Amino acid sequence: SDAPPLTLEAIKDRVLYVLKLYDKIDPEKLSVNSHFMKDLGLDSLDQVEIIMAMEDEFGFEIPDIDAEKLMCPQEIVDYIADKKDVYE
Amino acid sequence: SGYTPDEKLRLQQLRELRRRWLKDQELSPREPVLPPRHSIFAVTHVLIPVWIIHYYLKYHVTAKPYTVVERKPRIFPGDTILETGEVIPLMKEFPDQH
Amino acid sequence: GAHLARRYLGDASKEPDPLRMPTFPPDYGFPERKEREMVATQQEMNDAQLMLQQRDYCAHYLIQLLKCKRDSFPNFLACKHEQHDWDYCEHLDYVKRMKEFERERRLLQRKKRREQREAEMARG
Amino acid sequence: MLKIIIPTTMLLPMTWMSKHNMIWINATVHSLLISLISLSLLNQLGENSLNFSLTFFSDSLSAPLLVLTTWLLPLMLMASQSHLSKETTTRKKLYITMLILLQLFLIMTFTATELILFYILFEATLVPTLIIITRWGNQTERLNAGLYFLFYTLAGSLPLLVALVYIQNTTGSLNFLIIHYWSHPLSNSWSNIFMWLACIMAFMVKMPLYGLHLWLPKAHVEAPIAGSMVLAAVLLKLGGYGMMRITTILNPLTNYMAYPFLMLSMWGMIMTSSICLRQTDLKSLIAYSSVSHMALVIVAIMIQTPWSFMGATALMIAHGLTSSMLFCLANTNYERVHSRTMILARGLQTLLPLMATWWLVASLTNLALPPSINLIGELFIITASFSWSNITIILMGMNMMITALYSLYMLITTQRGKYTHHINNIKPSFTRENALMALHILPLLLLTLNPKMILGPLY
Amino acid sequence: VHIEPRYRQFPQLTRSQLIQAEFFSATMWFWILWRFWHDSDAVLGHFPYPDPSQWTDEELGILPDDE
Amino acid sequence: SKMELPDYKQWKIEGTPLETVQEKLAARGLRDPWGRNEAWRYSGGFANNVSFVGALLKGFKWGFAAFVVAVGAEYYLESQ
Amino acid sequence: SFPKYKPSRLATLPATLDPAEYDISPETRKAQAERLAIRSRLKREYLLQYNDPNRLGVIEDPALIRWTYARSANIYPNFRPTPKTSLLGALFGIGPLFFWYYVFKTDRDKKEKLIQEGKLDQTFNISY
Amino acid sequence: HAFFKAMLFMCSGSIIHSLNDEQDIRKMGGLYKAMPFTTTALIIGSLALTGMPYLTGFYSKDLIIEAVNMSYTNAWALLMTLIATSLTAAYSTRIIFFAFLGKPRFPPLV
Amino acid sequence: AFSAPAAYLTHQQKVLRLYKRALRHLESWCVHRDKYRYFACLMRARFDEHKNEKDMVKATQLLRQAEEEFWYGQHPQPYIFPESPGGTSYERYECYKVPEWCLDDWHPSEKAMYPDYFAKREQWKRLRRESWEREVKQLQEETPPGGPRTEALPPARKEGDLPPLWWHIVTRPRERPM
């Protein structure tokens, strides 16, 4: 059989993984609730590189209109979860 | 940039509802409540069909002219016929360029 | 390939044409020519059902190979001498055809050389 | 022939004296029984037709047509009783009476010995059909459709009446046997040219010939389901049967009087097949397909060879079964969603799988897949046409391609993709509908095993 | 045979797939070498190709241009 | 069953072509902040990969050894 | 700078290459807002019936009905005999018929006068 | 050709299924070690497709090229056949180089 | 897919979308990770060169000629994620998605199996039936007189209210429904 059903917890661990592999983000001060522009001091192009990293992570593409608003890791977790039909 | 308050609140409410629905699509431990020899394959799938076909060809199809035609068998110099006991002479003493 | 280069770029008058060949008699330059013989009879090639293009001057070796393959059937690797013999006969047939080609080419060159140069010795 | 005919007539008072809730049961049972008895006309002598009496006779051309008629009646009853449920008892009995009278007229027309009786019955079929269309038709457009169906038909058939009475005055008889044995060549004169036209145009408009075909989309689309079934399966074949009978007194004139009709039929084959590619209505598409098939039959009859006559017979029968099946399939969905538009309901294979299987099989016989009898007829006609002229293959070849195209287009549009989100009233298939489809399809498949039965007199 | 994912690491390998893969690759190469040892003619040719310029006119039957 | 992620602290671009990219970009006044995300494609079991000709010649050693064994047996067998 | 892309009928012009979407005026923005509003009013009207619990059946679409009516029944009421209509009708209607008549008549005349000559290779042609 | 072309398709299928239904070779990295048996099979199939000696492809294709070389044939057809014989080697090389050599280019959940 | 669109895209949105497209097509051209990473940093730099331009006209012309460059230099065969609108698996599982209203046409013998699922479904149906009128009334309350202006929907605001028009969003089939 194929891959086991995704669990929100594995999702969120993975998003945090890619986020601390990003050079412009402080690992010891990044949280699941950290705003990208406001708390971490990034601009729109950093946020675009971040969504592209997330699609490279989870192997599925995110539409531009929807992404414009994924401004914290929790929002990315919620988007991926509601897209791939994970409740827990 | 980002969601508006109403957008985020509605996404949260829809998310809770959707996750409850997906949770309730699960089956309970009893859900499908259903109401109330080693060589057997080679004999019914190979042996029986070849009995019917060989019977059909031997006594029905070959009971009429020109239904099963086999190209006549090759004959070579030095061969011996089975019916007549003929012998076809061999072939003219090759120049033997050994 | 060189023959194609000679025919299509050089003077095609000096090259044999594969469709119309030979144009010279078979007894022209030779004093005596022995005509090619056959080892297999028509009836043998008919009883073997060889093929109409395998019924050339090498067909007796083909009958050898075919009978020997049918005789030693399970050992499909025992008909080596027969295969080599048929191959060798075919190779000699092919070099005969090459000699025919070469023979034709020289005659055309020779004929052109002699005819137009007797025209040379006649123009003065 | 009396043994088949009297019971059919009996069906009339049997349905008029039945209880209100047993009309469909009784009519279906005894229609099926009549169909079984008719099945016995397929035994044919060989050299000549079976002449029961002075008035009636059966042929190898005739036998297949009669069996198809009698078999189509119970299927029409099964298809009708759903949309006629709200109707009063008297009007349901009147509808069944119309269907029975139509069957009776049809059986007699095919077996009449002489042309005047054939003409009278061939024309009598107009009244029940018109009543069915205009009284039980769903749309407002049915009245216009009825007028088109009537007038196109009579404008062709009245010159035929004049020609027939003239021919009996000059020959002394219209009996088909005497007509055949005493046949003499038609000279090349203006009088004979117009006699030829008057003998041919009625059957041409019945087929229909391309350009005189406009009544058919109207009438076949605006009719109730049983009306459409009988209009496509049987009533189109009156033209082919009549032409095959009448062309015996027309030689040798047909040799060149057939040219414009052959041109019209081949090019209009291409035309109606192309039309099927851009059609928004699903019944309209099936109607034009019928036109395309009958163009092929017209070519086969006009070129007058034994292979072409055999192909024409086989194609008539196969078309009659396939076209009725396609109309019933469309009607099931219409009953669900109350619209004829083809893109309204999509992805129906996800909701109705067995009906999707019926759709696939009907679409496969429509494009004449070997070794179905649709392809047998089409291939025989194409070979005869090739002998007639080798350039016909281009037109024939083109037609085969366009037919595959629109058949699979219809299948893909209605069955595949995703279902329309809004429509939520698509209930499971009823046993009645599945049995109706099977009773269309099983006979067609069975016919492949014994091809000679539908081949005809020439065989 | 239960193999579980590994997330950014080289996947878990069993001994069976390695032994089978290496066995069959080695089989192919052994077969090629065996054949070329026994049937090198099928690749290199067996009969010599003649050179037409090696051909005298006595065997080839043309006269010396004076007749 | 129920694995979790290796430590993100290990993915370092030194010794990998990402280091060369980093230095060639520093030679321009630029920098790549995503190299540690790709470092796993070079770190572990994907450290060393074969070339094309070395891949075509996969089982050549065992095959040649078996071939020489068999032809030596041929050398030594027809001597009866 | 770079070679230019020119559109055609069956390969249209991309939106990012359209000079019209880079020359924006306030009237353009008001037009876009009007279009969005029309789309929005239609979407709400559809979703109010789509989500209705008590609604069973097929929601009827007047745009689809207008399309099918225009494609079938409204065509003849809006037809005029015009030089273009008449010439196109004559061409596409009777041109092909006469073309095919010429082709087939020519072919069959050739074949028949060839049969009269005793020259056609008709051996083995029993079936027709 | 039936044998080794069916095998090539089955190898591609095993790759596609292992890489979460991905078919673009630009996202297939170093599988020469990760999928050893699939690699062995696809290499042997590529060598049969290219006419490696004493292989199934060799008897069928090498004889065909030999017969096309030595017959009274259209010259352009012969030239195109030879160029295509080179092209076959090139595409086979592209699949192996792109799909089996190099570093991984697929998502991280292996 | 999930968000209501706006009447138009701002200059900033167009610029971000062009950035993403250029990066993806560059990755398609630059197969390997290191080379793509290098050229993507060069791209980001060339993009940042005009980051702080104040003249809207020149910014628009920069965007326009950048789009022309992208079109001339795009990949004829860019990488697509398999379930994306051009992917090889885009609509692969649409034949397995069955609407939930089909479950009401099941035979009682079919519903005899799965009693708990169908009890819970009756609960969900009760919930929808008892929420509908409040949803309609709320939508009529919160909507301007000249009809709605965007495709945006309000959340629930009271105690036991549900977000209006939620049934067909909550009861989607699934994305791997079988």
Ligand SMILES: CCCCCCCCCCCCCCCCC[C@@H](O)O[C@H](CO[C@H](O)CCCCCCCCCCCCCCC)COP(=O)(O)OCC[N+](C)(C)C
């Ligand atoms: C839209 C679908 C409608 C249905 C299609 C109906 C098709 C009807 C067409 C009839 C086919 C041909 C009719 C007669 C055959 C030849 C016609 C004539 O043109 O041929 C020449 C005739 O010569 C001249 O053409 C005279 C006829 C010209 C006058 C007729 C007017 C034609 C104009 C077209 C009007 C359209 C008619 C259909 C109305 C809808 C032959 O020369 P000739 O050997 O000397 O005459 C043979 C007769 N003989 C032996 C008694 C002497």
Ligand SMILES: CCCCCCCC/C=C\CCCCCCCC(=O)O[C@H](COC(=O)CCCCCCC/C=C/CCCCCCCC)COP(=O)(O)OCCN
């Ligand atoms: C739904 C549309 C269908 C339209 C069909 C219309 C065409 C029908 C065919 C022609 C109709 C009239 C034919 C007359 C009936 C045949 C009778 C006959 O053969 O007698 C002829 C008589 O022939 C005629 O008189 C016919 C002349 C035509 C009169 C009516 C003209 C109507 C229009 C004619 C052309 C239309 C026909 C084709 C149109 C097809 C439909 C588009 C010879 O007899 P005698 O007078 O004794 O001559 C020899 C002794 N001296």
Ligand SMILES: CCCCCCCCCCCC(=O)SCCNC(=O)CCNC(=O)[C@H](O)C(C)(C)COP(=O)(O)O
């Ligand atoms: C191989 C594939 C083909 C690739 C070819 C593509 C060629 C691309 C060349 C480069 C394109 C340009 O310079 S385009 C020149 C456009 N100039 C401007 O936009 C100046 C004003 N800046 C702003 O508006 C914002 O700061 C903004 C920058 C949007 C960020 O905003 P955030 O920080 O708030 O997200």
